[PDB]
Amino acid sequence: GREGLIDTAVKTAETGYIQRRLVKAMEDVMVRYDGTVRNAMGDIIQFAYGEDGLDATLVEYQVFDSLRLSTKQFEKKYRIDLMEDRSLSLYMENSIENDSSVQDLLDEEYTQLVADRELLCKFIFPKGDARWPLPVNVQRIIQNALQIFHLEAKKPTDLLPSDIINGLNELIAKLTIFRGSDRITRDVQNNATLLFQILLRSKFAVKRVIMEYRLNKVAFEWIMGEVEARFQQAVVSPGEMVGTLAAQSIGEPATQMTLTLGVPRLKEILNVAKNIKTPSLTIYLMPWIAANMDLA
Amino acid sequence: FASRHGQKGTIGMTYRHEDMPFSAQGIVPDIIINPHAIPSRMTVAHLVECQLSKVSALSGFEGDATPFTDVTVEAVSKLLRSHGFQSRGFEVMYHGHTGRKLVAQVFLGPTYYQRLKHLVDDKIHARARGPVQILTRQPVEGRSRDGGLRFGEMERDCQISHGCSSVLRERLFDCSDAYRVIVCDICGLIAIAS
Amino acid sequence: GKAVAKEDRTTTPYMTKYERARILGTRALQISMNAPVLVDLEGETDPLQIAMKELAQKKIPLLVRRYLPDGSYEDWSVAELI
């Protein structure tokens, strides 16, 4: 118990100094009206706050369904083949069997979905993690739509595939963080909303919107408007002190850290100690070596 | 107020005799403490003290609470049960407001409490305006001398992260040491102003 | 500092929370100093509530001069802000 008391009495001062140092380093970093994060000298610290330009208050964890699905399951859940598949019209008020233009739209949809899955699995989350904080709780909005409109799973829907594609594309076009007709403004807008677009396309696939959710035109329009409004509410406001907010958000948990790990390691990181207590390497071997003890 | 086991608290409310829970003998507690204080703190000595004090108040023999003795909670429980009470110190209590018998049985008994030198009236302080330091012309320090409260670095940081520029301007300028000077537009130094 | 044209404006078309706080505070302060009220009063006595009800009807006669990091600025009416 004496050790515990001593640790408290020392850790308090350690973390107080750490937090003062942190705040002094980032007090001047603020979000500007052009979306960039800059310090008092105008030097750009980030080109978009958090790399997506969203307030950390408004984000919630969402699951990427397409990430962990196999190729077979991904096809089953997202591939629509009107030539071979006829169950789609069983879920619809309008027959679309053996329709050419609708099949072309579905093929473009599935090509974009496969591209998104490739980008997720190879570039973004190669470790296969699916739960990540994004703007707007889209699953909750879908549940709200199911409850509000009393969606009967047995009632065929009046939604056409083209309605779904056009609505989702227009929604994605209305998630504006950066404004401007230039080329790099378009690039940064696309990058900022890329992950959200991937989630939206995986959630609102035509096969899901029809066979899984049984949405109708009114419910789908309400979902689109609600998602657009919620996203526009998550955008970080210009003039927010993101630097001091980050300093406080890192410092506050330090006051409960364990006094290498804990406050000592944080102190080593923050001062950029040229000599640290426990230098180490994490050498990863080749796949055939790493799978055998003898070669290791 | 505090027990002899690190259990310190302040009075949050006072109830009169009629409004407090009572036993079937009409015992009303002097103090009611929250159960949640016990588990995390693991002050089992507080509970053993309450049970032993109940036994000693009933029997008149003084209670030996010396450490490292063979006084077990089982023996104290047997002594308490010998007086016609629930061995573990629980009692059926009734609600003062409705007279209804509480669903839970209460741990009720005598415990030694201490009045601490920290009284709220010794501490309550409010300043609107008053004395200032001669040199800095800011609110003086101290409750006793009618002084202001320190708006420190951490509070300034909190108001910065909030984004309340006018709050900072008011707290640090309009409410502490507002002053006016005349500067020369040529050399930028404070001028002679009448 | 060069004023940006109304058509060229690139900042958000929504009122920021900081902008809303500043606008309400400034209008309430002006009302407390006997500025004419541009909304019908139903017996309100707090200038802040009067400014809030003016805002709900977009009747606050104020602009926001949003400054870009280079010094160019855009003037947004409290009425046109969303």
Binding site: - | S165, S166 | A21, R22, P61, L62, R65
Partner: peptide, 15 residues
Amino acid sequence: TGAFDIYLDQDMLMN
């Protein structure tokens, strides 16, 4: 809250 400046719009004060 001070990352911008407030001005009067006289066009509105006329109307």
